[PDB]
Symmetry: C3
């Protein structure tokens, strides 16, 4: 059982130019609207998140 991780970008614009480099099974975070995805074998799945709050 291998390991992956989480890759980060500040903006969607920057992410879209580089996301092809992300290996399968890694997570992808885009800071501007606090979005999270996971990379699949042949696509992407968006993680479902509740609304942003200052506290948990």
């Amino acid at each position: 059982g291998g390991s992956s991780g989480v890759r980060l970008w500040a903006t969607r614009q920057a992410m879209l130019g580089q996301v092809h480099e992300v290996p399968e099974g890694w997570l992808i975070f885009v800071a501007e609207q606090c979005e999270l995805y996971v990379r699949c074998q042949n696509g992407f799945r968006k993680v479902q998140l509740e609304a942003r709050t200052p506290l948990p």
Copy 2:
């Protein structure tokens, strides 16, 4: 404040035979269905994911 990470397996079958060894607080990726779980102290929680798309829109 310690760190965990993400563990991955290619198939559900492969995962189910080894996943008990994953420590609490790690994420678990199963490539076959492109699914994610979180390891709890006593069990697992499945992450809700939207359907697969070609790009992260």
Copy 3:
């Protein structure tokens, strides 16, 4: 295109005492309630998780 990770705390209160040290884009696991959050700039988004089960369902 940097990298982040996952960090672990036992409780919401323990986490909150350290959260200023957590940058945006890190995932946060809280063992009490087996909950997962993502750090945003100035806050958190809770990951939607299904119910805890003994096996990955």
